[PDB]
Design a protein around this ligand. Sequence first.
Ligand SMILES: *[C@@H]1O[C@H](CO)[C@@H](O[C@@H]2O[C@H](CO)[C@@H](O[C@H]3O[C@H](CO)[C@@H](O[C@H]4O[C@H](CO)[C@@H](O)[C@H](O)[C@@H]4O)[C@H](O)[C@@H]3O)[C@H](O)[C@H]2NC(C)=O)[C@H](O)[C@H]1NC(C)=O
Ligand SMILES: *[C@@H]1O[C@H](CO)[C@@H](O[C@@H]2O[C@H](CO)[C@@H](O)[C@H](O)[C@H]2NC(C)=O)[C@H](O)[C@H]1NC(C)=O
Ligand SMILES: *[C@@H]1O[C@H](CO)[C@@H](O[C@@H]2O[C@H](CO)[C@@H](O)[C@H](O)[C@H]2NC(C)=O)[C@H](O)[C@H]1NC(C)=O
Ligand code: NAG
Ligand code: NAG
Lengths: 801, 48, 48
Amino acid sequence: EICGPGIDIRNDYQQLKRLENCTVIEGYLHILLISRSYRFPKLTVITEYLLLFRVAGLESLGDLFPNLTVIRGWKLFYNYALVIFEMTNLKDIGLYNLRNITRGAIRIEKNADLCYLSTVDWSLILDAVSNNYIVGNKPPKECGDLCPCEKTTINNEYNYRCWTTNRCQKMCPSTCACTENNECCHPECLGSCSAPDNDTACVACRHYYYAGVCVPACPPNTYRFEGWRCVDRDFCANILSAESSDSEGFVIHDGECMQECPSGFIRNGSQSMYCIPCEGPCPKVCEEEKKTKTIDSVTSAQMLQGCTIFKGNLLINIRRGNNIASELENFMGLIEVVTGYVKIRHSHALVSLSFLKNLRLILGEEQLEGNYSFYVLDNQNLQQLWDWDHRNLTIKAGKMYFAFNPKLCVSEIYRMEEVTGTKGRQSKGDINTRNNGERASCESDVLHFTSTTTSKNRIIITWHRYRPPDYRDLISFTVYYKEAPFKNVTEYDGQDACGSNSWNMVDVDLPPNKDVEPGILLHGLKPWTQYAVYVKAVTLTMVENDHIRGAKSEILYIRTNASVPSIPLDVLSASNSSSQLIVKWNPPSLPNGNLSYYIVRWQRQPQDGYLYRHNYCSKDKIPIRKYARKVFENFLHNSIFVPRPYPFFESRVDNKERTVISNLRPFTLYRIDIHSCNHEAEKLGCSASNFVFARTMPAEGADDIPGPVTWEPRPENSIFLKWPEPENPNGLILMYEIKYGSQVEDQRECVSRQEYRKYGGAKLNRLNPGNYTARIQATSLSGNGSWTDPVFFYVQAKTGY
Amino acid sequence: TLCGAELVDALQFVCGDRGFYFNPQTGIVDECCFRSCDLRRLEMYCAP
Amino acid sequence: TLCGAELVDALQFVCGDRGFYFNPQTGIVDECCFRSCDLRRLEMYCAP
Ligand SMILES: *[C@@H]1O[C@H](CO)[C@@H](O[C@@H]2O[C@H](CO)[C@@H](O[C@H]3O[C@H](CO)[C@@H](O[C@H]4O[C@H](CO)[C@@H](O)[C@H](O)[C@@H]4O)[C@H](O)[C@@H]3O)[C@H](O)[C@H]2NC(C)=O)[C@H](O)[C@H]1NC(C)=O
Ligand SMILES: *[C@@H]1O[C@H](CO)[C@@H](O[C@@H]2O[C@H](CO)[C@@H](O)[C@H](O)[C@H]2NC(C)=O)[C@H](O)[C@H]1NC(C)=O
Ligand SMILES: *[C@@H]1O[C@H](CO)[C@@H](O[C@@H]2O[C@H](CO)[C@@H](O)[C@H](O)[C@H]2NC(C)=O)[C@H](O)[C@H]1NC(C)=O
Ligand SMILES: *[C@@H]1O[C@H](CO)[C@@H](O)[C@H](O)[C@H]1NC(C)=O
Ligand SMILES: *[C@@H]1O[C@H](CO)[C@@H](O)[C@H](O)[C@H]1NC(C)=O
């Protein structure tokens, strides 16, 4: 009896009755928020994970599932195969038949009455014992882990192993997968054995299972289902994934029966039970229930995001809107094939259809009345289609109708049917010159630029004076400029006459004096940046001749002059060793040219002069300087509760943004200046410095006493200890400590650095007679040194011969 | 705002014997713990 | 990020003997304490 594909028991205590027949639970198991005696000896295997949470009244897990042997953990709950969290009244994990947990780890948390945690050797039940989490339970010091058997090494200890107070932890002998009492199971077996080394007598199969047999790999005409058994071809032809609009059956792939084809695979036509390898980015076909998808807003086009093929019809009716050309191009820019027709009606905001880029095929399953597959009408601002000489298009069936598109030149739609392939298919009234191309300026003159002058942020550019075709026409100019990273720039990139998507526009008038030519000064530009500039003429014709001409200039690419680069970004430094400093950074924000190299500088910083003056045997704190469960509860709550509906040294780094400085004074502060030059830094000069401070590693063993300690008797019953000073300490020696005593070095003397500078040592004054031992330790800025070797001195009771 | 074990205590209190319904990880913590939620929002996490 | 007395310690360290210049309460705390600032931004708070 298999139960699945997911058991979620909660609220009602009596709802647990759903496990009365289940011997295997396909999927996870949830026993949550439960508030008598229920026994389920049938259950032995759980494929995924097991979760227990806030079950009141339950005292042990053996009360419910005594025969639970294997938790395969095919799919894990936050990388855990068993979660026992906030279980009140629970006293022990009574799963005394649990043998193997195949995958995930365990998280046992917040069980104030749970014992027998350390009595379980989880190293022989699961593998990833390091990633377990057993915190917040009843402390083993305040429990009483008592057995009523065998034992082994747990961590560094050796102690007995028991699941509960009546049952021990069962183990197999070293000769073997064993039965109840010392007989090894089959190699393909797992857990216990109804009979020794038999395929049909296994409580749980390792690898896979089929027809009562523990098989390594599935038989030839069977496939992997879930992670423990094998099913035939007709079984997965009856499975149905979670219900959606694009929900279909399961697929057979790589001898496995999964829900959907893996990444880089798509379902084969007709034979929809197998996955065929699509080489490119496999399509995301979008199927909508409504016959004709109307795009009357940017919010309506959102449902077409990421679609490759569209099974339906497109009706574009965009009157108003925001920045539309860049927005629709995010949604509809990936659509490549339209099964039906495309109608652009009343789309006044659209000046170009360029947002339909990858659209290379329009079929014609359904066509508008009159057999039309492409139908545009009343587009007062559509200057151009998406049909420029770069894009491809193919309309398989249907005609094209164009009417009341005034800004669209009639020559552009004649060029469309060349690639479209419908040259002589339309009628004489489908494409008419009367209401189309009415306000369009097709054949236009050419404005010629005359001179360009470039700085680091200003550009002066002038074009030739333009005499209009008629004497009466009032003439004005308009400068279109924008930052273009590279040259593939089209003149159409906005929407309507409000599309501020890209081109910056400045209206400059024709100068009064006829000797000076019209020009424009651009101010506030990024240094070393390629700008696309072109000028258009504003010819206001007094005699409205429908032989519209106009003037337009070539796209001129102008790059400004380089400047001083920006400071390097985020300078971080560390010290992996003494006399070494590693530093990393990011390229500057505004490089202002091609990056060539970086110039780093490091300067020795002096030790603090205030540190040398104070007597640190009186101060309590000596200064030290350095070198170089909620998130799971949120996941458990987000899943359970578902609501109902010194000089400077200088070096140049050639390529990378990382470098290591060598030869440094150990435990010394350093200023790290980093500059960023470019190709024009030889004349302009390299950039400024983004600096940081870092201290090297302390020289290990360099702040201890470098010689033996000597002693000399002094007046009274005194002893004058004398020891050499560390030549190269880690920064500075602040104080010394003398540890002396007769039998135990009990007395301790503090020696300041100022005291040592006067006498070269310390005088232990007035001691009781007897033999003594002494040890001295130097404390530097990085820390203390090691104690010296014990020196032996005696205090005579009567200083004499 | 209710969070953690303090949250599930109020959830068991509001539902009481009614229980919790069950049948995209922007769950109740991102609703009643990250932001302040009233008890009417909590009750909608119960059963019918 | 540097804040409070920890901040003015680094400011006196960076400027040193150079001093601090002086001559809309979105000051240095809303620059070097609210957000992370590098030592180049700190040095611009010193004197010439
Ligand atoms: C902004 O940067 C622009 C380049 O990105 C500058 O445009 C460049 O300007 C220079 C000088 O005005 C111009 O001439 C360069 O090439 C000449 C030919 O090699 C060179 O003249 C040589 O011969 C002279 C005698 O025959 C001799 O005296 C001289 O030393 C040279 O050996 C001239 O000196 C200079 O090397 C470039 O052709 C021009 N480049 C472009 C692409 O237009 C512009 O001036 C900069 N403007 C500012 C304000 O900084
Ligand atoms: C529980 O049984 C599984 C059976 O697969 C054991 O999994 C082994 O895992 C290691 C490491 O990934 C593989 O090298 C082995 O090949 C796996 N075994 C088999 C039979 O394929 C797992 O080690 C067992 N755990 C315990 C504690 O016995
Ligand atoms: C600083 O002093 C501590 C103890 O006062 C030193 O740590 C001891 O090091 C010895 C080895 O020489 C060990 O046998 C002891 O067990 C250590 N004791 C402790 C409490 O750690 C430490 O080595 C000294 N610092 C340096 C750089 O030598
Ligand atoms: C120009 O073409 C290149 C290569 O296809 C592309 O990286 C770039 O984005 C294009 N320009 C624009 C403005 O999209
Ligand atoms: C001190 O040590 C010496 C040598 O071990 C020993 O002879 C002597 O008895 C000890 N005691 C005194 C008081 O000198």
